[PDB]
Amino acid sequence: SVASRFILADVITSTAFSNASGDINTYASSYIEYEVGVDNQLYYAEVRENEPSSSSTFNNSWNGIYSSLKNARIIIDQCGEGGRDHGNDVTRGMAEVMAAYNCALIADFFGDAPCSQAAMTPKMDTQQEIYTQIISYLDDAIANLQKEDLADVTEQDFLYAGDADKWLKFAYGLKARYTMRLINRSSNKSADYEKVLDYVSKSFTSADDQAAFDIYDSNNINPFYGFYNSRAGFGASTSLGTKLLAYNDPRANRAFFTPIVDKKRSQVAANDPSLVPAPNGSPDQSTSKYGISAFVYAKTAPTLLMSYHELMFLKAEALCRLNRDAEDALKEAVVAGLLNAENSISIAIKELGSGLNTNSSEVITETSAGKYFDDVVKAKYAANPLQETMIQKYLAMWGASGEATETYNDFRRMKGLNENFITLTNPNNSSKFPLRYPYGNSDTAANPEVKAAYGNGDYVYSEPVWWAGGSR
């Protein structure tokens, strides 16, 4: 038994570092081609050999998400009447938001799964049932966050330093994310799009409001950076480079580093052969052959539980689907995405120091980004509003921020909507594009229901999740 605030510190840390931007994000990066898995486990994921369908693969992530959920629930109980932490309603609300967040990771990645009974052998809840719980948590949160605390949670709130109004914005931001998530299943899409717009209006007003776990240092590292630091397992994505080059996106000439040659990597354009980008779905296995995204060296970049740019892309997507003008919204989203990219790129350059030869590329600014939007994106948006909007969301959400996780949700949601806006080139996707993550072996062992649902794991390639038009 410990005070809820101390538990919350852990829940926030674990949700950012291990849950949202850990292995779930690592593998997503490969699946939607932000990166190429070039060594060991991620190599096998890349070429789709066993790895994507094995119950072992996400066992740790699985256990971690359930652990964080349990802890959040302990806070919620402790903060209730009769609880040791009674009167800490604001802390309670924060915990309710983290509970929602973790339930969503469960539902989004694994589909139907234990929830209501997790935290005998818990039954599996339908993904729809989990989403009902998710929204319910957020509604609870919205109410509680407007109350008070007895004990000051400030130093334990690694997200917002005790600012309940920012949490409230975050809760609405999540309502937007989750409303759009389930759109395929809606009985009234227009009402849903209008809800998204309303929720956005009550959410982040700028990047300063965004839900960022920004406590990384020399000694406490970013998890994306961490993976590369530990495994050197990513290579620069060819498919991604093709897109960037086609658009002449500012990041094309700025977000890529060559392999190490004579003790130096060099910052090069996506089409410079010295980059040695990795072919999606077919690299040679090696931790030294292929070039990389700048993002793998973004040691202290924050983990974005939900970005301002993502929120603006939601706003833009909602307007597009409503047949309304999304231009201003899209610009705001593209510029914010570029500025976040530049933040991480700069962190990475600083971290590499003398290990890197920079090119002559200019720092991406609010001005340069805006001009790029005007010069390139605006016309493409005019031509195909929705399509362009989602391509841009996709390009913005590439980084060290932990956003692959969410990009992978968007990709699969588009699939369920029979939309083909984001091109993937992995040849193994003909029959081995993972529609979901396999259940953790901890539960295939302990839970006959989960064991039955996991089968031999082939289902990960044939059974979409419910919000994607699936049944389980």
Automatic annotation (TrEMBL):
Keyword annotations from UniProtKB, A to Z: Signal
CDD domains in the record: SusD
The organism of origin for this protein: Bacteroides thetaiotaomicron (strain ATCC 29148 / DSM 2079 / JCM 5827 / CCUG 10774 / NCTC 10582 / VPI-5482 / E50)
Membrane spanning stretches: none
UniProt cross-references to InterPro entries, sorted A to Z: SusD-like_2, TPR-like_helical_dom_sf
PROSITE patterns recorded: PROKAR_LIPOPROTEIN (PS51257)
Entries under Gene3D superfamilies matching the protein: 1.25.40.390, SusD-like, tetratrico peptide repeats domain
Protein name: SusD homolog
